[model samples]
Target: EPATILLIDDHPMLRTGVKQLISMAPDITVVGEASNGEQGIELAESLDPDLILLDLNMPGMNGLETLDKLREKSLSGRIVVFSVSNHEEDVVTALKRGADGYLLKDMEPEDLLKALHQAAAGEMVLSEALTPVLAASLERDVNQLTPRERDILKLIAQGLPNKMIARRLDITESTVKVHVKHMLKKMKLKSRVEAAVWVHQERIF
Candidate 1:
């Protein structure tokens, strides 16, 4: 399937460079280009591209601002941050703003094209170096949550037994226990007791 990309970059040289890099990718094509985020947002909503190749350091409305605003539209195309930034906070913040993935713009050209195609294939399309970076950062924040798991977490926060929580959520006790089991592993916790304690601080905070 063809995946159209919208380039949101103020850098003239970078725009041409990105186009050249993507030219060889047969399945993907650059559909539009926006010098800055104002036009970028307009083009995005109208074009409804499959992927957005955004410059993180745009002159007017920067990528982070554009990133969140773009997400509000909820287009089919995933917003991808294209930059040389290796900042963990920036990358993680991008993800938190509903970005599909981050790509280091200074990467080898071939790898960048490959990543674009891969990300176009309905994936987040992150580089290998960022795999652990993403995991380590998000793991520290407990942002990797499942809907059902959070339900279980909140129930446990209120000091309910698994069976009782399951009954309240209209799920099986075994299922409730499994949510806790998986949640604890992903959240890097010792047990349900610890999770409850943490959830308490958040509410008070």
Candidate 2:
């Protein structure tokens, strides 16, 4: 089945254009639409879409506020900020709040489609222009983790199994497991996959 998507923006025209664009892709579909953040959150819960395209500046309950509420729900779907603002602070804030990706509204249609597909495939998506900002923001969080946890996180982001991570780090499997558990708890993440994606998105090398 194609990946289901929800579009949340105040402009009906924008949603219409986006829906039309997504129709060209065989593996993705726009399953729902909302005109504001409040409505978007309601639809997100009811539809449980695979991906969410969010606009940052809305009349009420702006994108950042909406994003925060969505993250608080601990939903499984991925959220990507589709906004005109590429401000470093906004991008970093959205990512820190669990947004899977940040995309500019002015991106080429083809690039936008590709980024959406990549996000649906469970990959962290960010434009090349914003990578430096993301890296700087990530460095701050790296300080919160212990040395061992950072090492394990790096390997995890590389898709290493626990056994392989243990072998690579010269530690026992149980120790690897303990580190992973601790890391997730400290990161406030629900799973190893989420933690790994966070590491990758943050570019925490």
Candidate 3:
């Protein structure tokens, strides 16, 4: 069965375009739509959609407030914010509020489709441009980085390339690569760039 999705955006034209685009995905379907957060939440709890795409800036009840209400109700669905706002503050707030995902509306439609699919499949989704923001807000609950891994990560924070890190550590690049992979996994980071930014921003070195 296709994943059921609900749209909580105020714009009529945008919903129509999104519905049209979502129609192309055999694995996903649009089950409902609402022009505002209040109506959207009412429809959402009753309908209990598999996934929700909520607008951040709604007129009556704002997206953040609506999200809190949904969470308070303990709805059994993943809520993803679809907004044009890319402010770090807002993105971090949405995640802090227990939103499963955050997406930028300016992203390519195809990429948006892919993200929704991934979100429905129980994967946390965020736009590429906003990944660093997510990394910044994510706390390091797992402090399992080995001493060597921490050393490599410290070098990474200083903007040293893997090759340079290997040169400084007097080890082969292959060993450096292995250490980097281990540290990033422990940190739950998707890329070395994110790892570097996170360590640098948090002063975790």
Candidate 4:
């Protein structure tokens, strides 16, 4: 079966254009479209698509907020930012927030299609030109995690959720969440997924 997709953007024309562009790919299909983050959240819950193409600059509940909310929902779909901004901060922020991919709005349709395929395959997709900046941003204090934070980070890397980590460590769920929050701040990470990637990248146990 093809990868099911949802387009979330403020512009009607862009969504329409993207729907047509994605339709050309045999292995991809546009399953839904939302005009803003709030609507997108609702559609995401209902459609449960395989991939979501999100805009970063919507008027209400901007992309970053939307990304955070989506991560909270723990939807199985991978989200790729399809926006005009390629600013390094924006890219890094989105990545830290668990965005599976960060794609420029002006990419050739073919490249977009290919990147979507890569993201669906569980790969981190960033615009080629922005990679070095992203790398620099990810190089925060790798050794600064507290002992407890380090332990929790390991659990996070192992794909355990906060509740599971709390259970295994005999700690309260709220404590686990606090540690995760502080750990992410100290590491300059935006989400648990980024924390996991950083742990693997830095070879931190």
Candidate 5:
């Protein structure tokens, strides 16, 4: 079956153009379109599409707010930012705010299609040119940890069993427990959920 996409953008012409573009690809179909964030949220709630191409700036509640509301509703789909902005801050902010991927407006059509495919495949798609900047940002934030703590934290975030973490880390199960205990203490997180959330909150991940 073709991957269903709901596109939400304010411009009517752009909406029609994008729907046509997706239709050309055999594996993709534009299932719905919205002229603004409010309508987009409403459609998303009703359609339950496989993917969502969302605009960051829009009339009414705006995309960021809409995204939060969708998250609250427990909508599970890749929400990708298809916008004109190339600002690094905006890029980081969107992903931190729960975007599954991002694509620039001026990107080549083929590249956009490729990104949509990758996003559907559960990858965090960012433009090639922005990768270095993103890596640097992630590095600066996550590099503060000791190697052992980093290893332990990543395994915990993945929801690994203690024995599994021990096997992966080449440590005993008791040692894994000690490291996790210390890791949480140093990170100042009271629970595994908080630790996992903090690890990806543009802080340690």
Candidate 6:
């Protein structure tokens, strides 16, 4: 079966236009649509599509807020941002919050389909223009770490246990614990595991 898609956008014309575009491809099919976030949530629950094309601006419960609800329900699908906003911060924030892909409204139809394919393959694709924003954001935090601390951070994110972290770094267990504690405090994280998740998601390791 073709990958089922849920198209949620407030604009009727845009939704119809995209639906038509998607219908050309045999690999995808639109199973449902919604005019607002609330309907989006309901349709998503009912249809359980394989992918969701979401618009950022809607009448009720904007895309980001709606995404939070979807996450809460543990909706299993790739959410590709199909919006007009190419703002740097918005793209960065969305990806950081677990968006599967970010594509602009003005993107070529072929390229948009390519993004949908990538998202279905478990890859996170970002608009080329927004990659620089991610680089700059990470650069802001790069200098906050000492070289030694950075090494441990990378290992922790690699799923190394505390003892393994010590052995790999050639430090004592107590010393490793110190580094872990200081790293968490400096980064304001509740636990190293949370840091690990962030690292795995962002390749911070």
Alpha carbon RMSD to native, model 6: 11.2
Question: Which of the predicted structures, 1 or 2, would earn the higher lDDT when compared with the native?
Answer: 2
Q: Per-residue lDDT tens digits of candidate 5, residues 86-144?
A: 77687666665656566777776777667676554323424445444543444223455
Over 63-100, each residue of candidate 1 has an lDDT whose tens digit, in order, gives: 67777677655353456787777876777677655565
| Tens digits of per-residue lDDT for model 4, 1-205 | 5667888888776676677767777767788888878888889867766677888878864678888886665354456787778586776778766785677877777776677665543334344464455556565776787889888878866656444577889997567766766776677665555565667667766
Q: Write the per-residue lDDT of candidate 2 for residues 91-178, one digit (tens) a residue.
A: 6777766676778877777887777776654344344565455455442346788999889878766645444577799997567766
Q: Which stretches of candidate 3 lie over 4 Å from their true place?
A: 125-205
lDDT of candidate 6 over 1-205, digit per residue (tens): 5667888888787786677777787867788888787878888767656677888777764678876765444343456666678686776677655455567777677876676655542234344565455434431264587887888778766545444566788997557656765665566433333455556556765
TM-scores of the models, in the order given: 0.59, 0.64, 0.59, 0.61, 0.58, 0.59
* Residue 108 miss distance in model 1 (angstroms): 0.5
Q: Which regions in candidate 4 have their CA more than 4 angstroms from the true location?
A: 121-205
Displacement of residue 189 (Cα, Å) in model 5 is 16
- Cα error, residue 1 of model 6, in Å, equals 0.6
For candidate 1, report its TM-score. 0.59
lDDT of each: 0.67, 0.69, 0.69, 0.69, 0.63, 0.64
Q: Mind sharing the TM-score for model 4? A: 0.61
Tell me which residue pairs clash in candidate 1: 83-105
* Residue pairs in candidate 5 whose N, alpha carbon or C atoms collide under 3 angstroms: none
Could you give me the TM-score of model 2 versus the true structure?
0.64
lDDT of 2 at 201: 67
Which run of 10 residues does model 4 get worst, by summed lDDT?
A: 119-128
Please list all clashing residue pairs in model 6, or write none if there are none.
Answer: none
